[PDB]
Every structure is written in C-alpha cells, then in structure tokens.
Write a protein that binds this ligand. Sequence first.
Ligand code: SF4
Ligand SMILES: [Mg+2]
Ligand SMILES: [Mg+2]
Ligand SMILES: [Mg+2]
Ligand SMILES: [Mg+2]
Ligand SMILES: [Mg+2]
Ligand SMILES: [Mg+2]
Ligand SMILES: [Mg+2]
Ligand SMILES: [Mg+2]
Ligand SMILES: [Mg+2]
Ligand SMILES: [Mg+2]
Ligand SMILES: [Mg+2]
Ligand SMILES: [Mg+2]
Ligand SMILES: [Mg+2]
Ligand SMILES: [Mg+2]
Ligand SMILES: [Mg+2]
Ligand SMILES: [Mg+2]
Ligand SMILES: [Mg+2]
Ligand SMILES: [Mg+2]
Ligand SMILES: [Mg+2]
Ligand SMILES: [Mg+2]
Ligand SMILES: [Mg+2]
Ligand SMILES: [Mg+2]
Ligand SMILES: [Mg+2]
Ligand SMILES: [Mg+2]
Ligand SMILES: [Mg+2]
Ligand SMILES: [Mg+2]
Ligand SMILES: [Mg+2]
Ligand SMILES: [Mg+2]
Ligand SMILES: [Mg+2]
Ligand SMILES: [Mg+2]
Ligand SMILES: [Mg+2]
Ligand SMILES: [Mg+2]
Ligand SMILES: [Mg+2]
Ligand SMILES: [Mg+2]
Ligand SMILES: [Mg+2]
Ligand SMILES: [Mg+2]
Ligand SMILES: [Mg+2]
Ligand SMILES: [Mg+2]
Ligand SMILES: [Mg+2]
Ligand SMILES: [Mg+2]
Ligand SMILES: [Mg+2]
Ligand SMILES: [Mg+2]
Ligand SMILES: [Mg+2]
Ligand SMILES: [Mg+2]
Ligand SMILES: [Mg+2]
Ligand SMILES: [Mg+2]
Ligand SMILES: [Mg+2]
Ligand SMILES: [Mg+2]
Ligand SMILES: [Mg+2]
Ligand SMILES: [Mg+2]
Ligand SMILES: [Mg+2]
Ligand SMILES: [Mg+2]
Ligand SMILES: [Mg+2]
Ligand SMILES: [Mg+2]
Ligand SMILES: [Mg+2]
Ligand SMILES: [Mg+2]
Ligand SMILES: [Mg+2]
Ligand SMILES: [Mg+2]
Ligand SMILES: [Mg+2]
Ligand SMILES: [Mg+2]
Ligand SMILES: [Mg+2]
Ligand SMILES: [Mg+2]
Ligand SMILES: [Mg+2]
Ligand SMILES: [Mg+2]
Ligand SMILES: [Mg+2]
Ligand SMILES: [Mg+2]
Ligand SMILES: [Mg+2]
Ligand SMILES: [Mg+2]
Ligand SMILES: [Mg+2]
Ligand SMILES: [Mg+2]
Ligand SMILES: [Mg+2]
Ligand SMILES: [Mg+2]
Ligand SMILES: [Mg+2]
Ligand SMILES: [Mg+2]
Ligand SMILES: [Mg+2]
Ligand SMILES: [Mg+2]
Ligand SMILES: [Mg+2]
Ligand SMILES: [Mg+2]
Ligand SMILES: [Mg+2]
Ligand SMILES: [Mg+2]
Ligand SMILES: [Mg+2]
Lengths: 122, 208, 137, 99, 96, 82
Amino acid sequence: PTINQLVRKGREKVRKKSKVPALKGAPFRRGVCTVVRTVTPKKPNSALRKVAKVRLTSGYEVTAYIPGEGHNLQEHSVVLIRGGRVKDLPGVRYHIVRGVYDAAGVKDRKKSRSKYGTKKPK
Amino acid sequence: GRYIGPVCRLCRREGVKLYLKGERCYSPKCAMERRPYPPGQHGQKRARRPSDYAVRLREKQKLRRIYGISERQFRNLFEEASKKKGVTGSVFLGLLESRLDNVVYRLGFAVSRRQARQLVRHGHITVNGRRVDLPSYRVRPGDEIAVAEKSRNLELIRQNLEAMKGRKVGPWLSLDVEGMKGKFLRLPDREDLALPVNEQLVIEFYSR
Amino acid sequence: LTDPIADMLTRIRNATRVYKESTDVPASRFKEEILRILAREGFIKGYERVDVDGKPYLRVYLKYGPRRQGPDPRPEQVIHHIRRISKPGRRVYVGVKEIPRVRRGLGIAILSTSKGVLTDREARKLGVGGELICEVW
Amino acid sequence: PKKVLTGVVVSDKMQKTVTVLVERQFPHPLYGKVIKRSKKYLAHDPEEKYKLGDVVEIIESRPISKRKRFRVLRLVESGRMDLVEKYLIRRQNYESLSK
Amino acid sequence: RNLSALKRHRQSLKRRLRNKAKKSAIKTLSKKAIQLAQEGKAEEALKIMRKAESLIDKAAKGSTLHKNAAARRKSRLMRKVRQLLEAAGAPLIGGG
Amino acid sequence: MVKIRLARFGSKHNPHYRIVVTDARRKRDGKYIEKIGYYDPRKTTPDWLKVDVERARYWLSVGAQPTDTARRLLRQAGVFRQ
RNA sequence: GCUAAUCCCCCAUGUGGACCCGCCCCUUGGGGUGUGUCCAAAGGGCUUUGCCCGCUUCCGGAUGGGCCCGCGUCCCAUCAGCUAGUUGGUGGGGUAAUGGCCCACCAAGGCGACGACGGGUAGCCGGUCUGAGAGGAUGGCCGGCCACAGGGGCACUGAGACACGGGCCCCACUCCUACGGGAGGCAGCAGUUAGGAAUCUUCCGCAAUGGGCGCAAGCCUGACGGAGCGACGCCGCUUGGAGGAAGAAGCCCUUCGGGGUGUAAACUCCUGAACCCGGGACGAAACCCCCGACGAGGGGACUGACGGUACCGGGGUAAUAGCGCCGGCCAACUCCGUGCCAGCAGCCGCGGUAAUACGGAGGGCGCGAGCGUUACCCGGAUUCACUGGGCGUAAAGGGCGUGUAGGCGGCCUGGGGCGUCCCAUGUGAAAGACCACGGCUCAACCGUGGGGGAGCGUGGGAUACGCUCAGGCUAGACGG
RNA sequence: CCGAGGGUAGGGCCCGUGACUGGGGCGAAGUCGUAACAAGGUAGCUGUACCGGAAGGUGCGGCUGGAU
Ligand code: SF4
Ligand SMILES: [Mg+2]
Ligand SMILES: [Mg+2]
Ligand SMILES: [Mg+2]
Ligand SMILES: [Mg+2]
Ligand SMILES: [Mg+2]
Ligand SMILES: [Mg+2]
Ligand SMILES: [Mg+2]
Ligand SMILES: [Mg+2]
Ligand SMILES: [Mg+2]
Ligand SMILES: [Mg+2]
Ligand SMILES: [Mg+2]
Ligand SMILES: [Mg+2]
Ligand SMILES: [Mg+2]
Ligand SMILES: [Mg+2]
Ligand SMILES: [Mg+2]
Ligand SMILES: [Mg+2]
Ligand SMILES: [Mg+2]
Ligand SMILES: [Mg+2]
Ligand SMILES: [Mg+2]
Ligand SMILES: [Mg+2]
Ligand SMILES: [Mg+2]
Ligand SMILES: [Mg+2]
Ligand SMILES: [Mg+2]
Ligand SMILES: [Mg+2]
Ligand SMILES: [Mg+2]
Ligand SMILES: [Mg+2]
Ligand SMILES: [Mg+2]
Ligand SMILES: [Mg+2]
Ligand SMILES: [Mg+2]
Ligand SMILES: [Mg+2]
Ligand SMILES: [Mg+2]
Ligand SMILES: [Mg+2]
Ligand SMILES: [Mg+2]
Ligand SMILES: [Mg+2]
Ligand SMILES: [Mg+2]
Ligand SMILES: [Mg+2]
Ligand SMILES: [Mg+2]
Ligand SMILES: [Mg+2]
Ligand SMILES: [Mg+2]
Ligand SMILES: [Mg+2]
Ligand SMILES: [Mg+2]
Ligand SMILES: [Mg+2]
Ligand SMILES: [Mg+2]
Ligand SMILES: [Mg+2]
Ligand SMILES: [Mg+2]
Ligand SMILES: [Mg+2]
Ligand SMILES: [Mg+2]
Ligand SMILES: [Mg+2]
Ligand SMILES: [Mg+2]
Ligand SMILES: [Mg+2]
Ligand SMILES: [Mg+2]
Ligand SMILES: [Mg+2]
Ligand SMILES: [Mg+2]
Ligand SMILES: [Mg+2]
Ligand SMILES: [Mg+2]
Ligand SMILES: [Mg+2]
Ligand SMILES: [Mg+2]
Ligand SMILES: [Mg+2]
Ligand SMILES: [Mg+2]
Ligand SMILES: [Mg+2]
Ligand SMILES: [Mg+2]
Ligand SMILES: [Mg+2]
Ligand SMILES: [Mg+2]
Ligand SMILES: [Mg+2]
Ligand SMILES: [Mg+2]
Ligand SMILES: [Mg+2]
Ligand SMILES: [Mg+2]
Ligand SMILES: [Mg+2]
Ligand SMILES: [Mg+2]
Ligand SMILES: [Mg+2]
Ligand SMILES: [Mg+2]
Ligand SMILES: [Mg+2]
Ligand SMILES: [Mg+2]
Ligand SMILES: [Mg+2]
Ligand SMILES: [Mg+2]
Ligand SMILES: [Mg+2]
Ligand SMILES: [Mg+2]
Ligand SMILES: [Mg+2]
Ligand SMILES: [Mg+2]
Ligand SMILES: [Mg+2]
Ligand SMILES: [Mg+2]
C-alpha cells in the first residue's frame, strides 16, 4: 500500500484466539463430572477413550480427557482440569489432572508418575 | 549440588580423557585406556553420524564436565562472557579458570578438581590471608592462594605439594612450595591451555 | 511527471543495463548538482548541457567495467545500484548523527543540505545533515 | 513563553470572539511522512475588529471563558477567504457521509 | 470508642457559631449601607459603611475571613456606594 | 518546613543513608530536593561520610532544619566551624 | 448556678498593610504615592536594669500547592451525527485565584470522518519483559502523580480536607439490648470468613532512620526497623574426597563364546555438612551533661528489638536425590508384555501378533533441591512487512465512468525561513539499565563514581530540498 | 432555591434464558442415487429464474479456467 494509505488506515494488530476459553485466563479450573463415559476416536484411530463432561466453577461445562490406564471417576466427582486437547477426540480441549480432588492417580505407574498423580514407591 | 556420581563413564561418552581422578588417570587402570567407547548397553555398536546439534551439545558437556560445574553456573558465566568486551571464547575460558576451586587444582594443592573443591569447602584454602570457603569465588590478578595455617600440617596437601615440586605449573600462575602459597598473575590467554575443547562450538551451542 | 529526480535515477539505471554510451535527462539545476556528485565520485565519465529538439537536456556519459570472460561477456557495472530514498510521498531527513554508510563506505549517499548537495563523507566533513536524496554503489 | 500560534478566522458570528483555525505539520511517528493537522481556537476580540478571512496571531492568555484561553494578538493578513472556503466545503461535505 | 478527635469536633462548633455570627453582621451592615447609598443619604450610608469596613477586617484578624476575601469584600462595598451616590450626589461625610 | 535528613538505602542489615534535603512531610525514602552527601553508619569503606558543605550551608542559611543525627554528621564534617 | 487562661470582644497606638477615588511608571489585577476610611497583640519559665520559649502587624526567602495552555495517550463507524448552561456577551455571585464555576438577562452560537456523540476496556508515567534494531507486550514490587475510604449527598473546623481510624443526612447490611432503645464501617497491621487453581505471623522493638508534640527530660509512632511462614523467585552451599579388579553379587542383554550397569560397590585411608563448648558483635553517638557564651570548639555519660544471632575459636559424625525425557523435529535403545485393545500424542503421527512411539524393566540423555505440566507475554512470524510483504493463474484491482475532500506535482529568478539541517543553553528527579571501583568470605544483594540521548523551551545561524509569496518560461495540460 | 435519593410513566443498549424452529461443523466401516474430475459419457463454470427426494435439471445471457 502507499505510505499515505498507511497513514490513513495503519496496520491491524492481529489478535490471538485462546484455545482454552473455559479456563477464563486461569491455569486450571475445578469442576464436577456429570457424564463419565467412553468415546470412540476419529480416523484412522480406533479405541474407547474415557472422557468426562465437567461443569466448571467458571460457569462453563466442557468435556475433559481422562489420561492414563484406569480411573475412578463417576458422576459428582470433584475434579481439576488443565489445558490440553486430544487431537483425535474432536471437541475435547482439556485434560483432567490426575491425583487431584477425586481423580485418583494411576495404579502401579512407574514412569512419568508426575504426569499421572502417582507417588513414589519403595 | 555438583555431580557426585561415577566419573569414567564421562570420558567414555565424550571420547577423550578428562583428567577427573588424579592418580588413576595416568595408570593403565584408567577406564579410558581399557574401554574407550560410550558406557552402557550399546557402546560397542558402531556409531551413526551425529547431528550438528549433537556435535555442539557434546563440546559443551565436555567443557562443563571438565570443571565439574553445574549448568546454571556454566551458563551464567557464559552470559557474562558474551555481553563482555569482544572475544567471548577467551573470556568464558578465563572466567572459568578464575574459579577458586579450579585455581586450587591448577596450583597443585589438590590432585583433582573434585578434591580441590573439597579443600575449599572444608576451609583449608585462604585468599590473601582470609579463609575463603567458596568454590565459585572469583580469583583475580594479584591474589595469593595459600593453605591455612591449621591445615598446612595435614597429610593430603603435604603429599600433594611434594609431587608438585616435580611439576611446572602454568605460566599465568606462581607456586612457592614449602610455603604452600601461590599467586594468580593474570587470567589466561587462549593458548595457555590446550583444553580438549573447541570453545567456538560452545558459543554456537547457545546461539541457537 | 511527478518526481524529476527519481526519473533521472531511473533513466540512468535503465541505460546502464543495456550498456548505452549515454542517456539524456531533462535539464534542471538540482539535477546538475547531483550529476556533479556522480562524476567526481567516478560513477559516470561526466555530463554536458545539451539541446534536444529545442529543449535543454543533460547528456549523461555512462561507464562500465571490463569485458569479462566465460558465457555472458557483459561487463560488471560501475553503478551497481542507484536508489531513490526521499520521495514526494515520504520525505526522509537525517541529522548528521544518523547519516548512513552505504555498503561500508564502498558506496555513496547523496543528500541535500543547507550547505549544498553533498556525499555522506562530505556531509560529516561539514558537520551538517539534510534530506537523503538517494544511495548509490 | 506564552504559546503564540498563527491561524485564520473561520467564523466571526459571535460577540467579542472569533474562531481561529490553526494548522501544524509534523512527521508521522512511524511512517515518517509529513502530515497536516488542524484545530479551532475561540479567541478574544474585545473590539470586534476581526472578520472572516483575517490571518491573525493568538497568544495564550488567561481564561476569558470555558474554551476561551487565547487573545488575538495582531493581524498578519486580511481577506484570505480562500481558506475559509476550504473549511466550509469540508463541513458541508459531511451531510454526504450520513445513514 | 474514644479520641482526641472528639475534642476537635466540640471546638469546631464553638468556632462555627463564631464565624457564622461575624459573617451575618458583615452582610447586614454592608447591605444596609448600600440601600442607604441608593437613597443617598450619604452621611448615613457612609457612617454605616465604615462599621461594615471595620467588621470585615476584624474578621480577617483570624480565621473567619482570608485577607483577600476581606479586601475583595471591602472593594465591592465601597465601589457600589460610589456609583450609587453619583446619582443624587453630595458625599458628606467623607470616606474616600 | 524543609529538613535535612537521612533517607536510608542499602539493604537488610546493610544501611546506607543519603544526606538529603527534603520536605518534613515527604515519606522517608521519597523524592527529595537535593542530595548533599551520603553516610555509612558502619564505616565499612574508607569514606563512609561525605558532605557538600557549601550546599549544606545554603539550605541551613535559607531555612532547612537538620535532624538530631544529621546535625552531628554536619558537625562531624565541620559545616558549623569558625 | 460558680470559675481560670496564649479562650473571647472593646478602646488606644499604625512600623505597617488593606480598600476606594486621583495622578506616575509599567502593561491583563505589576509597581509607586497623596487624601479619606479601616485592621495588631499573649502571655509563660529561670539564675532576673537579663536571657529564654512564646505573641502581633508587614516584607523577603524557601518549601508545598491551586488554576490555565501546546503536545502525546487503547478497541468498535455493525456508534455518524452531537449540543439549552448548550457557545459567546453584559451585569453579578463565588473563591486564595482565572472561568459557565454559579445566577439574570442578551445574542445564535459551540463540536464533528484530522472521527464529534455513543458503546467497550483501562488508573497514567519512571520503568519492566522481549527483540538485531524497529517494534511488540505490560504498569505487581520500588519512586513520582492521580483517584477512592461500605454505597451516595453535603458542608463545618482549619494555612491546608469537602478529611480512611472527623461531623451531618439518605440507603443497604450487621450487631448489642434490661426490648424502652442504641452501635458499627480492615482498600491501616495481624487475623477471620466467602470466592478462587492460588497468595503469610492475631510475632519483636522503637535500638536505628523518619514523623508528631514538647524548653527539656521525654511520650506516641503495626511508618519503620527486624523476626515468622511459603523452594514463589534469584544467588550461594551440601549429600563427600583420593584409592580400589580385565572387573564380586544382583539385575539387563547375548550368536551361549560373551556384552552392560562399572571404579560403580564393597573395602583402605583422608577430609569433617551438621550438631557439642567457649568468647561474642558492627549497626550507636547524638539529643542531654561539663567548661566555654544555652554559640564555635573541646570533654563526659546512658541507650541494641534483631541477638547470645552473625561471625571467631576449639571439639566433631561420611552425612537427603530426585524429576523429565530417549520415532523425526531433538540429546539418548534394547528385551519383555500388550495385539486398532490397553494407551500415547506440541505438530507430523504411533498401536491390527518380532512396536527403538503404548506399559514395565535394563540401559541411556538432560537437568538437579529441584524437575516437569498448565496458563499467559515477546521471539522465531518479512504471518500487519516504518526498518521489512503482496494482489494474471496461490488470498488480493473497485463492473465502468465522473468528480468532492484529501495525497501528490514541470523549468527559471528572487523575498521570507514553516518543514529540514547546525551551534549554543535550559529541562529530561531519585531508583533501575550500562561501564569502572569497592562493602557483605563469593554471589545474589548493596554503596560510590562515570557516561550518554531522544523529546520539548529559548538564543544564534544555514537555505540545497520541501513549504509559501512574488515575477518570468513553454517541454505537461488545455484551446484555435 | 438547589439537593442524595425515593416514587410514577415511557424509551434505548447489552447479557442470560425459552416450547419450538433454521441451517452449520464434526463423527472407521448406514440408506438413495452418480452431479463434478477423461469430451466424466449432456463440456464445465457462471449471474439470474423456475422446477425437482437428493445431488441437480432447464431457460436466458455471459466466461474459457473447454476437448477434438
Ligand atoms: S581414570 Fe581415565 S576415564 Fe576415568 S576419569 Fe580419569 S581420565 Fe577419565
Ligand atoms: Mg491408527
Ligand atoms: Mg461446583
Ligand atoms: Mg465419589
Ligand atoms: Mg510418556
Ligand atoms: Mg569416587
Ligand atoms: Mg539468542
Ligand atoms: Mg533467539
Ligand atoms: Mg532530526
Ligand atoms: Mg439579616
Ligand atoms: Mg485571615
Ligand atoms: Mg538477616
Ligand atoms: Mg507532599
Ligand atoms: Mg484598633
Ligand atoms: Mg457549565
Ligand atoms: Mg441561566
Ligand atoms: Mg435564548
Ligand atoms: Mg483536529
Ligand atoms: Mg467499566
Ligand atoms: Mg479499572
Ligand atoms: Mg523481529
Ligand atoms: Mg502502557
Ligand atoms: Mg499486574
Ligand atoms: Mg465515592
Ligand atoms: Mg468493603
Ligand atoms: Mg462511596
Ligand atoms: Mg458515608
Ligand atoms: Mg479527598
Ligand atoms: Mg484523618
Ligand atoms: Mg478503618
Ligand atoms: Mg431516636
Ligand atoms: Mg438516638
Ligand atoms: Mg451513624
Ligand atoms: Mg491472613
Ligand atoms: Mg474454597
Ligand atoms: Mg523511634
Ligand atoms: Mg507494637
Ligand atoms: Mg571381562
Ligand atoms: Mg569389566
Ligand atoms: Mg556383574
Ligand atoms: Mg558379568
Ligand atoms: Mg555459645
Ligand atoms: Mg553497637
Ligand atoms: Mg558414602
Ligand atoms: Mg527433556
Ligand atoms: Mg532440547
Ligand atoms: Mg538422536
Ligand atoms: Mg504447550
Ligand atoms: Mg505376542
Ligand atoms: Mg506388524
Ligand atoms: Mg513382541
Ligand atoms: Mg508416543
Ligand atoms: Mg514421545
Ligand atoms: Mg517405552
Ligand atoms: Mg541451586
Ligand atoms: Mg508467539
Ligand atoms: Mg532462532
Ligand atoms: Mg513482528
Ligand atoms: Mg496470524
Ligand atoms: Mg513496507
Ligand atoms: Mg505474502
Ligand atoms: Mg483467486
Ligand atoms: Mg478492471
Ligand atoms: Mg458495485
Ligand atoms: Mg483537487
Ligand atoms: Mg501541493
Ligand atoms: Mg516542486
Ligand atoms: Mg526553522
Ligand atoms: Mg537525561
Ligand atoms: Mg534518571
Ligand atoms: Mg546501584
Ligand atoms: Mg548509579
Ligand atoms: Mg435531580
Ligand atoms: Mg432521580
Ligand atoms: Mg429516601
Ligand atoms: Mg447395510
Ligand atoms: Mg452436468
Ligand atoms: Mg460423471
Ligand atoms: Mg458432464
Ligand atoms: Mg451421465
Ligand atoms: Mg443456469
Ligand atoms: Mg425440468
């Protein structure tokens, strides 16, 4: 564009769209589970992935992935959710944080136990 | 704190003797004589072409593992050298050699930098007449690094300075044996050392 | 025509790329003071004030390097680059402290100052700044 | 120093007060181009001696009223009705920007 | 449940009553002399205006009036009597 | 009133006052009119106190009042001498 | 109903000031002077024909402010028109003071695409974070300013407030009560509760600095100085040092010969984090007191919360290690288990019976009292392109004219000097940043010094180019 | 007189929420047909119009980014 156009109109400072809008600018948000269920993933993956539909302290109600093998979550489980989509479960933009509130850790976990609310064993 | 683990696997991974034990490093018992391949299961498997990030990471671990220094300090000291006047490679090396625990080792009060560090942390070393028990203390041109009076009558520095009578310490340094004191004359130039390191690659490492 | 100066910087640029012996420029005083710089600095053999179809022009005598060997024998240019800086759409004024070096001194910058038209090295000699007319190398 | 500006009387339709239209040029803080900008000043004229098209100078004076903080200093040029026409045409052109 | 702030409040009212009392008279004796000047009736206006001058400055002796409030109050008192007496003149006695 | 004061600097268990002329109501470490010296009440370095005596006399001459400790630091600098 | 005073009035004196009308200088209400009028007060202590603290009027200084102006200051135009105290004037009220700040009347104005009005969001700056710079983002700590003190309104006292721990009133809420009635305002310091992913001790002392009052001894000071909790952050330190086999056991791999963990361990010697004992701080010398002169200058005295801590000396035990990762990006690989399941996943992608990608194990890489994760800012992103991008077919030329505002504009001479360039000078607080030096054993932290700008105010100068004004031309353009 | 605010009445903006309703995005292995990509078996695309379960068809005029 001409310099005279830049004077008249300027350059539009781009704005970024958050990927975690349910978090309301917080790192984590507490909620309670309504539906705890399995969901199948999109092509080309096949599985029965465990998610929970969580109603948040920010008024929102979202779905949150339940990572690791085995969980103990059901309806009315108090939970803490974190940022994080699951590329292959469309519409799941959050992860439940293991080992917080009513999400138990992962039994017999030995590697990466910090990412699964599991403590150290003898 | 500093790395207090096995030490021969260090040279084995880097592929060059890092004289980190003192006596044992000059005997046929040095593990770099016997098995000069990386430690662990796959050492004797034939190596692949490493990436250039690998080449620079390796040069930078070699330099750091020489002085037995934590990455935090090694990077702290790098950044002071960077923003300093001009030649970074020389300054990083000179500021590294300016550490008290290192100077204790270069002077010969100790046989290894690990031991040198302990001679300081246990107080056996003074600087210009005061107990200075800080491994990271920055020695400067002029100071006199000695052994404490309540320490000079101790087997270790007696024996250590003995074999030092047979040794000729670096030019930038001074050593009066039997007085058990030395002098830091000036921070080293580039060629004062033939450190098995190309410090230019270390600059290249952090510039990524 | 909207910028007689950029027109002359461009007439010469186009003339040197086809290796023309000379190229005529519509005549003006400010353009002499710029061609004055280009000749003394070696970029052109010089100029003369001529008359084309009754009107005053400026025949600029260009210059080129030696005939080269290989494919494409065409000689390297003596004016590699001649670029307008200050334009009618955006004037560019630098004080003396922010006068640019063109190609680490191997090139020149022509400016207009209250002491006349100078090169970058001439400007700091007289200690004055002005309007950055063009850069050349 | 009391700021002294120079402008033109675009409207004399008030008692003891004229509207002085001042321009100022400066480079764009990012695109460097020189640009014009303008501003109207209600200036004191206790002798109602100044009319349309006068090119006057105003001096920063004590408040005469809300918005009136300048006294007309001296006439510089009389009869510049060409400038007032640039002003009025711009204002008249505003009805064409409506919805 | 106490202070020395309660003493500052008990005192503020002793002073408020005092400051209001002085201002009342200042406005009364002054306006009185301005009506008298309009009639003019000059000896009577000026004999009163002077007591209006005395009360004004005696108020500026303390907190009831700032020096400049009094000087301005005095300025307008006298100024109004002048013009008012310019119609149906005879300024006798004198006070200016 | 203008006062001649010691505005503490330094760090915890590390005092370093500045000899400063500042309003009586300005907060201690707040903006001051002028810095006319400094002070190190432990005397850890060779010159723990210094005073622009010619300036400290000006503010003394124009109204400023010192502290019961700043005064002993201007007498220790002979601002009051004969 | 009684009663004192630095409380309150009256008279007097007028150095003086104020006001009004005159003249003189100056020039917005600045300064002079004359006439008239008007306004001063407070006493207390000791050693006493003497000081001291106080008092009064006026001037000046100094500091702290008020008000006014140029300029700069975010998003939406799917907000385009806004305005009756509204804009100006005369008179007045008001104030320390200008002003529609407020009132009466008069005039018909003021503002707006150079974005008025409206809606959204936001305290602003020194600075901070990033960045090659340009720029972007941000305003917590610290300093300056502003704004508010349960929500609103108001004034009073005063140099100063329309006053957080002052007063009045209305509202919402809460509390005491003997049930008649009364009270309160933590966005002070702790502390409680609620909300939240989340944020501290109902600690110590005025010893220091600083504030208030006082002649002074001193008193008050949740300012402050310190102590407490929190790996929240940065910095420093430890969990050992040297020796020790062609190399134990255990575990992993194996082509069954062996390879690995690994000098790693044990074990030998050396040192001695912690803890035990003794000594023990700097921060604190002034105010006062003596002589002198209640000065100058000498000399004396008492005072430490932190703290019996730092640190010094002497004794002295081998004394926490964990977290992430190993398919490419990207540094580190094998065995087993699982069999599109269970699961992983920042992106590309892994898993369907020989998976370096899931889970465990051996081994390995990276860091280390940390290591990971999530959130957010800048960078990589020349992916809003001023530096520094594009539009035939990748996203991008308006369907085409005409034309307003606006942007931009040929050759020659001169006048001005607006832009622009230069010189001088003022401002650009402290802290921070950067460089040098030094104090805490180092460092972080901190002191002292040094060095700069841009921007704006002012004075002087230059005149090429841009601007303007004036005069001439004919190459553009237009007409015959 | 002004005046916090309370009351009455009528507007404007924004947010949330609503039986039902519109289409939209997405979703390993559903049902219908085969419009487009080759001249895709009627060259395709196109603005508009009208029609048809559905892609689509047809008219008018336009484009070549249409084949031989
Ligand atoms: S003994 Fe050899 S392998 Fe071991 S640390 Fe010394 S030089 Fe390195
Ligand atoms: Mg798959
Ligand atoms: Mg809930
Ligand atoms: Mg449950
Ligand atoms: Mg994992
Ligand atoms: Mg060892
Ligand atoms: Mg970098
Ligand atoms: Mg980088
Ligand atoms: Mg400039
Ligand atoms: Mg009355
Ligand atoms: Mg008064
Ligand atoms: Mg401490
Ligand atoms: Mg102040
Ligand atoms: Mg009297
Ligand atoms: Mg108003
Ligand atoms: Mg009115
Ligand atoms: Mg009217
Ligand atoms: Mg404008
Ligand atoms: Mg708001
Ligand atoms: Mg706000
Ligand atoms: Mg960049
Ligand atoms: Mg900002
Ligand atoms: Mg903040
Ligand atoms: Mg309020
Ligand atoms: Mg509250
Ligand atoms: Mg309020
Ligand atoms: Mg209230
Ligand atoms: Mg207030
Ligand atoms: Mg108060
Ligand atoms: Mg309170
Ligand atoms: Mg009652
Ligand atoms: Mg009552
Ligand atoms: Mg009440
Ligand atoms: Mg609390
Ligand atoms: Mg809670
Ligand atoms: Mg105190
Ligand atoms: Mg207390
Ligand atoms: Mg073997
Ligand atoms: Mg072996
Ligand atoms: Mg073994
Ligand atoms: Mg074995
Ligand atoms: Mg003890
Ligand atoms: Mg002390
Ligand atoms: Mg051990
Ligand atoms: Mg990693
Ligand atoms: Mg990496
Ligand atoms: Mg690799
Ligand atoms: Mg991420
Ligand atoms: Mg199997
Ligand atoms: Mg397979
Ligand atoms: Mg298998
Ligand atoms: Mg994976
Ligand atoms: Mg992975
Ligand atoms: Mg694995
Ligand atoms: Mg650390
Ligand atoms: Mg980014
Ligand atoms: Mg990079
Ligand atoms: Mg960018
Ligand atoms: Mg983008
Ligand atoms: Mg550009
Ligand atoms: Mg592009
Ligand atoms: Mg296209
Ligand atoms: Mg076209
Ligand atoms: Mg159209
Ligand atoms: Mg035009
Ligand atoms: Mg023009
Ligand atoms: Mg021109
Ligand atoms: Mg100029
Ligand atoms: Mg500066
Ligand atoms: Mg500064
Ligand atoms: Mg500093
Ligand atoms: Mg400094
Ligand atoms: Mg009302
Ligand atoms: Mg109302
Ligand atoms: Mg009410
Ligand atoms: Mg079927
Ligand atoms: Mg078809
Ligand atoms: Mg088909
Ligand atoms: Mg077809
Ligand atoms: Mg067909
Ligand atoms: Mg059709
Ligand atoms: Mg049909």
